Amino acid sequence: VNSFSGYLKLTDNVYIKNADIVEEAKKVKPTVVVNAANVYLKHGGGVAGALNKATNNAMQVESDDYIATNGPLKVGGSCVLSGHNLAKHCLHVVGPNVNKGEDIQLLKSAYENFNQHEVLLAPLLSAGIFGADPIHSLRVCVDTVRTNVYLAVFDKNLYDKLVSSFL
Numbered sequence: 001v002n003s004f005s006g007y008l009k010l011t012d013n014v015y016i017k018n019a020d021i022v023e024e025a026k027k028v029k030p031t032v033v034v035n036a037a038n039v040y041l042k043h044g045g046g047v048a049g050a051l052n053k054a055t056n057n058a059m060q061v062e063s064d065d066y067i068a069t070n071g072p073l074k075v076g077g078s079c080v081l082s083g084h085n086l087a088k089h090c091l092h093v094v095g096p097n098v099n100k101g102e103d104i105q106l107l108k109s110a111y112e113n114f115n116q117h118e119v120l121l122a123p124l125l126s127a128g129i130f131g132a133d134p135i136h137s138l139r140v141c142v143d144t145v146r147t148n149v150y151l152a153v154f155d156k157n158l159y160d161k162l163v164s165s166f167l
């Protein structure tokens with residue numbers, strides 16, 4: 001048993017809910033929250049910016065030190081950093097950004113990072129301003145992730161469309 005509440009079950013291991021991932025993380029304090037990051041860990045806007053804002057910029061400070069030491073991530077790659085006040089850990093995962101012309105085939109590689117963690121709270125990768133089709137992102141998630149994933153869908157209308165179109 002875990003502390004996630006109000007999720008709809010999509011498969012054996014994937015759950016979904018219309019929720020603000022920031023508000024969800026604050027309530028659950030999951031072991032792992034997934035940040036939909038970029039390779040520079042520049043949390044300007046979106047989920048990245050919203051999680052970073054909720055940490056009072058401590059996520060960005062930690063991320064800048066990580067990049068100064070290690071250099072940028074790969075598209076499709078990840079790193080584990082602190083969860084600050086939101087979670088034990090934050091798994092920063094880089095999905096391809098369609099609005100920058102990155103290969104959508106890298107989405108599967110991005111989701112494979114989730115398999116290193118038994119339970120995660122996550123947004124849909126490569127959605128919103130990354131320009132991928134969220135329906136596709138959910139299909140890749142279900143077909144790639146084998147560990148238990150709790151997906152927070154912010155957009156109400158999108159949530160309803162993801163559920164009603166899910167095969």
Ligand SMILES: Cn1cc(CCC(=O)O)c2ccccc21
Binds near residue numbers: 123125153
């Ligand atoms: C990766 N990513 C996912 C989302 C989540 C979309 C949603 O749950 O509605 C998002 C929103 C704004 C900017 C980037 C975003």
